[PDB]
Write a protein that binds this DNA or RNA. Structure first.
Ligand SMILES: [Co+2]
Ligand SMILES: [Co+2]
Ligand SMILES: [Co+2]
Ligand SMILES: [Co+2]
Ligand SMILES: [Co+2]
Length: 155
DNA sequence: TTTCGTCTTGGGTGGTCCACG
DNA sequence: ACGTGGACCACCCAAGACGAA
């Protein structure tokens, strides 16, 4: 939010455009000696990336930049991951390209991942969002059901 | 080369919604 | 006679891998 925080760099700024410009040119762009974020609190410190285009997407965490805009006139939602914008898209249509494929369900998602939750969870059997308050033994399929409990109940 | 493509896997929030205790 | 608990979903989004452009 308007100011590099790359280790040592001190450019404050005016527009996302510029900052998210400076990074790719200043820090991520050039060099032939390995790409790693060096941003303040980076949850990976220096867990280098494989390719360097991968770092580049990562910053969008740090930067805030969701550059894949939606097209459907009127709507103005970006994302910062292509995959995402793709799905955000279908919703404008109803496109559920992604059927629960396996064992014999026939239900489908606008996207792959939600198809994989449902997919594993809804045909679960186990419930691994077990609450961890002693004298409960309360477990659910999804973090949401859990979460609601450990706080409607405990907490 | 590197980057994409698209999938897999995985860490979240807000909620409907209704059935059964 | 019935309230809520919790299964299931919608959106959120990071990142591997591995091959294709
Ligand atoms: Co900088
Ligand atoms: Co970082
Ligand atoms: Co849109
Ligand atoms: Co299914
Ligand atoms: Co509990």
């Amino acid at each position: 939010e308007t100011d590099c925080r790359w280790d040592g760099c001190s450019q404050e700024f005016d527009s996302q455009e510029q900052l998210v410009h400076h990074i790719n040119s200043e820090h991520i762009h050039g060099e032939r000696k390995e790409f790693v974020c060096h941003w303040g609190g980076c949850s990976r410190e220096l867990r280098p990336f494989k390719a360097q285009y991968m770092l580049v997407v990562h910053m969008r965490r740090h930067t805030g930049e969701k550059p894949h805009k939606c097209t459907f006139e009127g709507c103005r939602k970006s994302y910062s991951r292509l995959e995402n914008l793709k799905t955000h898209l279908r919703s404008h249509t109803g496109e559920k390209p992604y059927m629960c494929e396996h064992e014999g369900c026939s239900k489908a998602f606008s996207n792959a991942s939600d198809r994989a939750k449902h997919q594993n969870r809804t045909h679960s059997n186990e419930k691994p969002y077990v609450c961890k308050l002693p004298g409960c033994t309360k477990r659910y399929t999804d973090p949401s059901s859990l979460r609601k409990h450990v706080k409607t109940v405990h907490g």
